Symmetry: D2
Subunit: 323 residues, 4 copies
């Protein structure tokens, strides 16, 4: 039977005995992702270039993508606190539209390389508000282990939405002819070990000796097996999704321009770690599992190594050797 | 004033006082590219997954996409009445256009690179180079054995976050953005030029163990600059259109160089290296094999390989300085 | 606050304390309508005309729209797990859903009304009525033989200059515009109500020689008002969905009455007249056979015909008074 | 062998040995019509209704699209639009030699009910050697170089009439391309449908009343014609071209010289009809022979299958 995101989400919520609040939230997020995809593919750009007589582009697209997510989630009546990469402070939903959920998201990740039309993407993570206090930024400071749902949209050669919940990881392809996300890979599981590593090797000078050693073993295998292939798009959604689909390992470790890491814990690392763990993968900072870091600031950064468990375990063995 | 690919091509054809044959070829290629973009973005995939009660998925969808893209380009170019010989990355032999539809142009193309890149849903591209048939002999694969310098037009379409067509001709490089709401390529970057020195290098460092000693030293110098300037950034998508386009837009260097086990490189000269070398040189960049300019190689086989290092001229010259140090 | 069909239907389901079954049905219908819309606007027609050669067509692609439409609606409703008995203009007998997929609802629909003249690009449409199952026993086509009064939901999609879904339920009539750029039905008109009296009449006057004398007199009053008021304008698209939507939007009257060669009219009671009558009544309009309300007829055959006169209430009342005068 | 509008137009230009100017004009109209279609189908309406938190009328937008695309083609010198009281004169730097008269969005009267709407165009070559003026648009339809319409119905079709005949192109929205689907089109000799607003029955000339009576009670007592009246000229005329038959907008008392406009409604449709082997008459003469004195002047029109038009004229000549 054909399955769609709308039907899949409605049926999981029926199975969950819930009230429909999270269903309405995920419904609203789907709409926003379809509207982001349309703009990312440049529908209507002819009007910007004067087709009807009327005459920062990358910037405005991430602002618009933020507005679409913010508006769709607000009017869902399902949220109370929204944290966005585009916004310095947490947004507090007005009282008459408040619901039970906190949403952390990057509405257009990798946006700043739109000039090259590289893949861009959306990342989101959904929490049940935990405190009974008046809503505030504190409600978003929960460890990733508390995630109820998380995932991402990739605006690549096609638009795909990956949604991770308690039930596992499911991938949906957008059919632009009808505006429906079609279920195409069910209960995805990452392979135990891959043949691809992904990281910005331009920071090789700043690399920890654990990282340098691990990556040396991927290029020059001490057992003389085949070297791993390398890929790095520089957009987290593209690089993590390739790791999910093919296996392997993605690293963005600390460097001396980013001693706490480059990626952001709340709306980049935590959602991707959650998808990885639900897929049978791993996600570590080196010191602890990403999902166990307790945030103290909503835009704080973390180092991340994630992907196939044998590859992450192999990295972690090299890491404790450098204790 | 807004400009479209169709209007731009038509006006350049008028300025050239051509017969209109090349214009028709490029109109045909543009339609084909719009058709590939629609398939790449997965229009109608709901019907494949049973929305109307029918079909299983069966086989290799990525392969079928490459084949479908090849059939779109082949058929639009055949029906243009502007071509006689078609060389495609997807076909063993050159396709000879039937007598009734023969025109004067030779087209080498790679219609899509889905199968040759395990990256899934990250970018895909089409590359093309257009030559004028040089002899009046009955058409054969020999008519595509021309050096890249003989190209009249070349370029690529990138199916990325948006669909972009880059077209290079004697008038320079121009970049057109596909507006899917209306099926028009909108002119967005005019007479593009690459910057003389960039800050990004692009190659597959998994192959590091098989690197020629000069590639190792060059890359080491990008990661550990001897003058303690800032290291270059690294990006490697695995799709030639994507990696070359970023080099064009941001500057820097892209390398798929020769080495011991692959003494002629891996990429193909006629429909990968030559069109990109032409775009680079028209943009004021460089494209070398290490031994010579890509566009000066005279091919002897239609699927022959070439090493290629291309991009900002100061970076390519710096690599050639290191390459000659190890001669 | 923006509102979509998905969000609207979901909240209404939460309001009425449903189990979500109707909601999944309506979600399924929405998806089929989107796919029908895409086919009607001729997405992919270029493959039918050989853009990729002869080999690249046949699947859902080669089916006529009436067949494709039936397959889309049939399949989406079956896979909704919310229906048990389906009635379509396309199939002589009601379809009994497999027990593994059965829900509690009965759906009567016309997958593509007006496809008659889809050749001239006239607006066409989809019509649907939803009943709950009443019977103690195994689902059978007698479950669909309910009066229009038992409807829980009804409406139509119009594929005209734009695609619109008109949904009628207990809460009233609501209208959703399909945004093709993102594939969402946007709530654009809420709790819609017909005007009390219109200035347009709508019927096929070409068959005037066979008109019932009561229809002859009522049409004459429209064109030759006995009080020197302004005569009504005439519109007849020949596609029921388009004519009924204009009647809802602009007011007036639409007639497909009984004549003498056609004892009970031509339009079908279950999946043409009944849904349209339900929309009209929820909008403060009217719909009669001449002798009783359409929604009161007790059907005995799932494909039985019914005369229909519907629209603004003062216009249907004037017709009835002329009609009862001749009875 | 598939063909597109772009490739068909360019190939006809090559055969004509034209300089490319009219081909650029027609390319430019093709783009405008694709953009009108996109807006008519309501792409982007979600933004109007606040999907991102926070408006030109369709007819205004459509006029802007055609006007700007034609101006920027460098192929035109005088543009007459139903939306503009005076003719637009193109600035010297963007001037070509063609005069274009058009209705950017006919039927938008009642777009509130999502009826079919259309764009109609007629293209003339400027004869004079002098400065372009409104007078250059005052030509009989006989002088047309090209005419047609785009119908935004259940699907979008462009019908183009030229010397070479009538050709029909279907817009494939997946790829944004007009595909040639019906070639060298000819209308049926006689149809079975008549199209007019019978709400004006009280004002009909007795020729029209008697002709309509012939359609409902046939004198050879064949089957009565069916009736259709969409109320959008493009939709009713296109059905007439596809199925044969007759379409009439005759004189009534709020429109004593007809309601439809000669330069950009009647003349383009008359020219499609004639190139398809049909006819179009005011009743007194061929539409294409009327010499206009006002760019917005109205004309009565009866057009369609040749046998049905001749039959009307035979009834008309009786009441002469
Ligand atoms: N559509 C859904 N998919 C998966 N889980 C759900 C869904 N709806 C509700 N749940 C679960 O039920 C809980 C309460 O749902 P709600 O009543 O919608 O807030 C959520 O926090 C989830 O754990
Ligand atoms: N649309 C065009 N853009 C750029 N150059 C063109 C174009 N059309 C023709 N030319 C040039 O004129 C030559 C002959 O034109 P043709 O008669 O179309 O083959 C071509 O090989 C090009 O060098
Ligand atoms: N989405 C909805 N909109 C309006 N009424 C509904 C909806 N869902 C359920 N209902 C009402 O509640 C009944 C039971 O719903 P269900 O259990 O989903 O079949 C239906 O037959 C309707 O009367
Ligand atoms: N694309 C075309 N299709 C049909 N006829 C054309 C075309 N281009 C030119 N012609 C004919 O040749 C004349 C001169 O064209 P031009 O030099 O473009 O003004 C026109 O007025 C038409 O009669
Ligand atoms: Mg961002
Ligand atoms: Mg290939
Ligand atoms: Mg029907
Ligand atoms: Mg008009």
């Amino acid at each position: 039977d054909v399955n769609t995101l709308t039907r899949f989400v409605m049926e999981e919520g029926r199975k969950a005995r819930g009230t429909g609040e999270l269903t309405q939230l995920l419904n609203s997020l789907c709409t926003a992702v379809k509207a982001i995809s349309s703009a990312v593919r440049k529908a209507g750009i002819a009007h910007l270039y004067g087709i009807a007589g009327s005459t920062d582009q990358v910037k405005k697209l991430d602002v618009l993508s933020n507005d679409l997510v913010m508006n769709m989630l607000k009017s869902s009546f399902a949220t109370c606190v929204l944290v966005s990469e585009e916004d310095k402070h947490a947004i507090i939903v007005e009282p008459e539209k408040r619901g039970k959920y906190v949403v952390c998201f990057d509405p257009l990740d990798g946006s700043s390389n739109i000039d090259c039309l590289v893949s861009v993407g959306t990342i989101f993570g959904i929490y049940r508000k935990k405190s009974t206090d008046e809503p505030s930024e504190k409600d978003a400071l929960q460890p990733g282990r508390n995630l109820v749902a998380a995932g991402y949209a990739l605006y690549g050669s096609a638009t795909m939405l990956v949604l991770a919940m308690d039930c596992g990881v499911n991938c949906f392809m957008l059919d632009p002819a009808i505006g429906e996300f079609i279920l195409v890979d069910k209960d995805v599981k990452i392979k135990k070990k891959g043949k691809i590593y992904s990281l910005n090797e331009g920071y090789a000078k700043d690399f920890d000796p654990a990282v340098t050693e691990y990556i040396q073993r991927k290029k020059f295998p001490p057992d003389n097996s085949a070297p791993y292939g390398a890929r790095y798009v520089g957009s987290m959604v593209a690089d993590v999704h390739r790791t999910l689909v093919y296996g392997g390992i993605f690293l963005y470790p600390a460097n001396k321009k980013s001693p706490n890491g480059k990626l952001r814990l709340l709306y980049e690392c935590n959602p991707m770690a959650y998808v990885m763990e639900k897929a049978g993968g791993m996600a570590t900072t080196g010191k602890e599992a990403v999902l166990d870091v307790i945030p103290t600031d909503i835009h704080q950064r973390a180092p991340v190594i994630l992907g196939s468990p044998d590859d992450v375990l192999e990295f972690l063995k090299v890491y404790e050797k450098h204790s």
